[model samples]
Target chain A: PMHVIKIGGSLTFNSKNLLSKLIELNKKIVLVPGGGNFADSVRELYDRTDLGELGAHKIATICTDITGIYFSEISGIKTANNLFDAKKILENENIVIILPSKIILSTDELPCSWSVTSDSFAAYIAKLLKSKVLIIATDVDGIYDKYPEGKLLNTINTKTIKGFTSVDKHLPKLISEYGIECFVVNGNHPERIKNILNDVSDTYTKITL
Target chain B: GPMHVIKIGGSLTFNSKNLLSKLIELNKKIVLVPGGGNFADSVRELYDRTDLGELGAHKIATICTDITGIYFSEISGIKTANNLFDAKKILENENIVIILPSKIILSTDELPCSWSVTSDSFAAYIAKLLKSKVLIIATDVDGIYDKYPEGKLLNTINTKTIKGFTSVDKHLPKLISEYGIECFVVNGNHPERIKNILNDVSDTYTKITLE
Candidate 1:
């Protein structure tokens, strides 16, 4: 019944302001965070070291926990490890940030590779929670029609976005499978987030099945 | 082939290099489980201060064990295993294998994520999977005592007696009880203690069996 939102790691520079604004909304929200540079470092280490994909995936999940700790500290919001605990926190109308290591490792059917990033992870959580909407907070405005050359489309079918590098490689397929109304909004502008949350904003891109 | 699963506490990790070397010299197939030590304590601290639940803390504690496995491997020049399958494979070619526990725990989720379960329980889990009959828990102390500092050492105890015991975590006794397996608690500080137990020699350790 709560909105499942994902805060991408690209907005790490503006995380403090974004978290403050998100907290001010006073809504029941479950936040999933991207691994950011920490995960990038893990990828780099995996490339150089003898670590296998499973080992790298486990460590990368830990990186998400570290980032979740940072976000929890900065935002003054609660953090949960499993969905049961996250649901309990949401029942009390409190915002809960999820550190996805345990849940994903234990329950996720997604392949453990670089192909699945936070974007698809958010979609997976949205599917798990059976929430109708999923909002992705990123640095960019939204997905463009093509690339740097094309204008941003207000609405787009998820089926038409295959091989779209704007998000993770697996997100569009997950979005289509789950039938979640997905929104991509610029988190740097807190007012825009507020407007979208209130169903009054028309500046973001919507992805439908 | 039969094997012994030994769980080494973090308290003795820094000083157990000689013990590890002796185990390797014995050329016996064994699996080693590393305790979280200060790393696990940090996880507990973070959980207490933050809203992170027991599951999160448990996952992080497994990571601590992984890091500790790296340290143990570096000191003993042993190979580290991410899962039990790899460990079993390594044992066919090597004397001993060190288990990290995170990958296995992530996939299995066999135990509860609380203070009741620790590396001790993880060893039990591995032993059960291997159909191993014995598990040796190496700690700083000799064995479980009736009293804290002055009571006589319990030479042999029934699994039920371990319920009120403090030598191991709470979940271990239940696991040993359920599996009908034998567990030995010995002082790991001595290099020859494990070898003595393996050879069925009398030693200053406690034997726990299901009643």
Candidate 2:
């Protein structure tokens, strides 16, 4: 019943409003960070120079690790260096941050595409740690029917359809394969996630298998 | 052809531009690694003087690689790549390929956080991942010796036998051994030694291998 919370890196650069909201959560979560500009710098140079495909993703994951460090420091939360430690914290009803430095580095193989990002890695991390619920906290309120210009989808099926993408493409497959319940909520109002978890509606997108 | 992972010495400073030109002229597939130099030295100073902890300083130092990478690219007008895949495509378009290590190094915790680990280990890891046969470390020294200023050229030494830090960082030997990658420590002061050593004609550098 653990929740994998993917904190989009976008929140770190512009403002700390969302990060402040997490400190108020009582739910047990394995917090993850998106790469934001740290990975963007990697991408800008990677494109300009054509760094290794497999290697680029490694750097991107590392960028997320940097963000994870930021998340831990900002929230004054201790980091779960590995899943073994991560499990213990969740079992005790504590919130912990998992930096992907060692976790991502532990894998011998990596995907070469940008399609696999922190969003996807969060799902992968969720699967590894035996969590069945994934919450992706981003700057946006929720996934849109037309890039935030059209309707906001209250719920969407992972297998049925898909965009510029509020989340990474690989995320849908992971959700289906693992049958994990997923939520896309605007981290600016993290209480939305709290509402959803408590069986309330506070304007967020839900993904189901 | 396999790429060459070369860590340019920090002592070289602006002299690095010469080697950058040379590597580009050879038009070989090479992933250039940057020495921390002044940028990294700044982080160390901050770590020692201020309250910044080891991991924090180490993380800042890791980002320093990208700064140097950008400097090398700007001066040489060549581009930098993060992985071997882009390095290959970079070879197709251009000759010089400098690598920024922050992302790859930070992604995993295999490398320890300390002054003992430096650019040398980062280069070795890249060499291992890129599947390069030999790792070239371009430093100011001739090679690992019985004493500094050239007491006796050991030619080759075991990673375990390293008594203390010499030219390479303390962790480099162990990392190379663990990854089973062969490493060469040569005087980057004479940039041509990199080409000579890579060709197996150079005699001054030390070759590090596992027992």
Candidate 3:
């Protein structure tokens, strides 16, 4: 199956363990990068310089491209600047690096926030690619009711969870509209991801149409 | 024909207000080719430390080309190209400029020095492709010198008298003969000077002519 994994911003731009895990999986994985502080930096510059979203996106895109290059070198994957190019390049190689293009014309505006971007962007890719599973690798294991502030909530199925609204409201609508299968997995623990892929974990935030 | 091939030197990206403004202002079709300076240097250093051979240089050059694509797409509104054909397609739109490799600048696979495909060769190759009447190389220095007129560095070599040769760069003289491209080496720092040359107004220019 084609696995579309969106690495979280904090883990990807600032940290490397999660990326290394994906590389180790050695499956057909397509990496979509998050803007991280790079995006924030560009956003700040845009506000200060009075540059528009396109200009800000350009700077952030460059930062993403740099990060993509660094990861591509480490992962031994072929890198492309945008998803369109990445899909084309993927035909020739198993591992591929993709930097988000500045010229993204979303039919709708992105649910603008740092935290849930990975969730939304990964869902977008899954929807576009018609992939079966869209995994959002985050620091937390799964979605929680009342913020499981201390540790992972042992087990709570989607059917039983109470009033748990996604921090980003756009998410549930995306999952529903896309008709795609999505999983929210703690990226901090690579084995959990591997276990799910291996059919070992029953505990995961499963989103379905 | 491809409308324009705008060559952005690697150094310019660091101090790129002028070039960026030019890109923003261009209303014509164009492709932006990047010069591999620091990017290539990093690759060379790594290759020297680890690979060390002719193969290493070739690998590093390809990496540099890849880096060029990433850098150009980042700074300007251009899609990156891994080879000549992708670059051509991107430029055909006539709106967004394309970033392409400088293989046409070399007669052989070997580059002059690591940095041989400098901005000059970049301009020459692109001009030949577009079949443009003029090819202008904007540099920090105002113009090329036969000898450094020591006190006067800005002294422009009169294009009429200075004979063009085949050996300086294999690509330039060859293109001059085959494509009839008039090449100019000018100080890009002075936009008016660049404009003057392009408009056939600047007498102070190094004009590469056919023998």
Candidate 4:
């Protein structure tokens, strides 16, 4: 089974060091990039322009187009703007990416609302592919209780995350809905993501179905 | 009155490698329109970052037009006239220069000027200027239909009879109408068939004016 990881856009400008570490690991990987501030701009424009779903979708796809080029140039791998084609490239054990334009959605379960973000999209992809693991690399450490600024609890479960009142409530719901196993690791710490992939017990929060 | 103006689609270069040889066999007075190929996506990326909407499309027009001039000059044994004045000079000098546009023309209602014109429209624009009899667009596919040709229906419509319809880029039919240009959409890999489209070749799918 192959592991699919998503690198956030917030990490895009300075994520080269982290990206280098991930590439050096030489593992089968499919990268899903965040829309970053570009996507946010697109969303803002769509709201004012009143571009419907398809129009907004087109703009959103363009955001990926920008990110896709960046990823391709940085990663030195041929990136695909088509999802089906990208999957084929991934089978070669090459570090390939399925850019935003290429992302074909069979389900609309993605968080179009504030409740779900790229996290849900990544989890949904993980469930659909039935991958052994899904790792989300963000700026913060593992999911911490109350304030994300404090020291990392180092570990947490759906139950612990649920113990809190409003922690992206859809997170647990999507995990259950998709039957996807996940890990929330600080992508800023590149080694942590690799360790999590190597062993569920090696790094951060390991959510099991 | 019945010459064929050949416009090759951008997707043909990257999607299909065997396209050029097919054109070579045609042996007609062919005018080649270059597609953006992989370069188009890059242009789009830069435009999105800096130019936003229509202005970005104008920038892409300059990019694709320059690429068209470079590729066609080498392959078709024809050089492009950089601007309308240059094209007129070539025509006055009795040089059969293929004229290609650097920017897409837009009506008052169109969004970004880029949102309007594609190579298809450019082909029409060139044909109208030359008063050519037929416009043939060599694309990656056989021709347009209600759905993709990969679907079950094999029934292909004659170019002259097919009606204008909505497209991913909506302004297509309007652009065609404004120029009063009639076109045939054919497979890019089969250049000979495209060049001989008006000659009544049975192999090529033809798209003509609906009226």
Candidate 5:
């Protein structure tokens, strides 16, 4: 089974090294990019302007496309807009970043909401691909006990552990709903991603149903 | 008059708001296709650097235009139409409307997906669909020049020779040529050119002809 990884936009901060580290491993994987700053700016647009909830979400969804394009460029991973081509591309490429705009906009499946962030989108990607695991590579180590700092927990049973600070508020619910294996790891290290994919890492947090 | 489809370049940047406000009189008569500007440019940045395929990159670019469309709507205080259904409503009832072309573009199986075919060509396609005779391209410069960055404006050019045209997109010449639509390029700063062209008052702009 393929591993579907959603790399947070925050990884853009250290993506240069982080991506190179992940790329060097040459694992067969699919990447879903967090909307990051592009989507964050969309939130500002939603709040500061007269944009409606649906329009803002549509625009926010485009960020995943933007980030997907960015990830494909940095990693030289082939880019796919839908699962159909992604499956074909996966036959040839070790890595593929799926740009979600065509599917999200065309399918009109996911509803718009402030609570729905890229974290949840990642879960959807994992479910759609029926991948073996869903890895969320963010700036932090993993699920913590406090706002920004706390002992890194090895397991998250129900959830924050619920402000949805690290991930979106809707993420854990979707993970349980889809019952997909998920891991939250510090992508800053890059190898943490590789090790986790290899099932050798103890630094990541696992989400359970 | 039938609705005129005019695409305003996002490169107009600071003046986009001013330009849209100036065109307030055209209001319900015109349909807008806003250029993606930096949003789409960033996508291009990656497409050029990465192995992103044309279809995937182009799809992302259309979504980029949707973003610009929504943004321009907020600043212009105009409503945005995402599909033909909504576009028809706003065109028939509201003030000037900007089209979020993501939906339409994605579903229009025949539309070419490439950098050559951009908002410029998309505007041309919509102009044909609306049966609009006048398609205005409001850009950062004064229409297509005899040469790039230097030379006099070629007031009238044909589809065959426009391959040398540097200001507009690469595919637009063919789009306008096939659609048999009369297209003009003008400085977006002087958005009032819409009136000059519509009224046949004669003004500074480059014209494209079918024959």
Candidate 6:
């Protein structure tokens, strides 16, 4: 079984190093990229213009494709368009970055709104792949109990994470529906991801159903 | 009840604004497939330089088509659709619709992502899906000829003869053969040429059908 990981776009600094480390691990990993500022630009355009939700969602999904292309260029990994192809790439022991626009558009489970961002999408992919765990690599350490500069919770269960703004609105529901264990780690430090992979890290917060 | 699948090339998009305006005023139910233009050329350049495979190149090329669709939509005031569902919905009330092709192509069967297959093959693919028997490809020239500049322009040709022409790509002949669809090549610079072709009047256009 391969691991499904979501790399936050805010980890712009040291991301090359992080990708390098992930590639060196040589594990079967599927990377789902966050849209980052490209998606923010789409949101800005949608807000200022008369573009509808479907249009905004479509453009934002393309922004994720751009981010995936950037990740593939930086990490020297191949990009896959669908889960079947992604699994085939993983079967060859290769790390694949997913361009989510095509597959996401075909699926009916996800809604075309900002509520379902990369966080929930990662969970949906994890469920689709039937993977054991999903790792969300963000700039922040983990989901905090309070806003902004609050205490970081060590473990967040699905019941406790409801109606929280730490992640997107759709994430907890997906987590509960899929029953997959998720971890949020600070991706700025390249070693944290590797440490978590090796079962030697307790710094990141774990979210479970 | 004959719907036309008109493929507007990038070359026509820039040089023939008058043709686009005429297409906007057209009353026939038409679906426009935008060419990749220079954006697709850049994709080809990148694919050749980097290790991007056929699927990656194909995705990027479709994105290029999306950019061209945006350009066409801005110029023609027509709504742009990313998939067939939206295209069909728009065509219900509108006379014309432009396709982006990325999402639609991703769900379809295997199409080689190379220089051989471009907007022409995509237009054929869409025509097959719409069950339209007619495909009008608007190029910078009139049609395929027996010889380069000196030979006579063949009024009617077969699929076998289409491969010898420089107007269409390599994959197009195969698509035309498989889909059994008739294609008309006309110079889009002369907007009146399309009007003539649609009216079945005498014009300098080449027709290709299964021999």
Candidate numbers sorted by TM-score from highest down = 2, 6, 1, 5, 4, 3
User: In model 4, what is the error at residue B201, expressed in angstroms?
Assistant: 50
Against the true structure, candidate 1 has what lDDT? 0.78
| Model 2: per-residue Cα lDDT over A112-160, one tens digit each | 5777877777887787766788888888877888544578788888764
Q: Relative to the true structure, how large is the alpha-carbon lDDT of every model?
A: 0.78, 0.74, 0.55, 0.58, 0.75, 0.78
> Predicted chain A of model 2: TM-score relative to the true chain A?
0.88
* A25-139 per-residue lDDT for model 1 (tens digits): 8667888888866867888888999998877877887787778889999878898876656776787755888887766664435777877777777788787677777899888
Candidate No. with top lDDT: 1
Report the poorest 10 consecutive residues by lDDT, candidate 2 chain B.
Answer: B159-168
| DockQ metric for all predictions | 0.04, 0.08, 0.01, 0.01, 0.04, 0.07
Weakest 10 consecutive residues, lDDT, candidate 6 chain A?
Answer: A103-112
Interface RMSD of each: 7.5, 6.9, 15.6, 19.3, 8.0, 6.1
- List where candidate 3 sits over 4 angstroms from the true fold: A13-16, A46-62, A82-85, A102-118, A147-166, B1-211
Which is the winner by TM-score between candidate 1 and candidate 3?
1
lDDT of 6 at A155: 95
Residue-level lDDT tens digits of model 4 in B1-211: 1335666666666534355545555435445555565477777776678746555565556457657656766664555754433344444543344545452221111223454456666666556645665677776656665654343322334333234332213344454556666667777766556646655667655454534
* lDDT (Cα, tens digit) per residue for candidate 6, span B155-208: 776655364555476557678878878888888888788877777788888887
Q: What would the per-residue lDDT of candidate 3 be over residues A1-209, giving only the tens digit for each residue?
A: 66777666656643466666666674677776666556567767877887766445445545655666666766667775444445556676655655544312211235233333445656666665566666777667677656556345544443444356554455667767766667777777777777766667655677654
Clashes of each: 0, 8, 1, 6, 0, 0
Candidate number that wins on TM-score, 1 or 5: 1
Worst 10 residues of 1 chain A by lDDT: A102-111
After TM-score superposition, the amount by which residue A181's alpha carbon in candidate 2 deviates from its true location, in angstroms, is 20
lDDT, residue B128, model 6: 82
Candidate 3 residue-wise lDDT, B1-211, digit = tens: 5344445555555655565555555455555555664575676687668746654464456446547657656766557654443444556664545454533322122234343344446555555545555655554554554454352332333232333321123345555556676666655555565445534573554556665
- Off-target runs (Cα >4 Å) in candidate 1 are B1-211
- TM-score for candidate 5, residues paired by index: 0.51
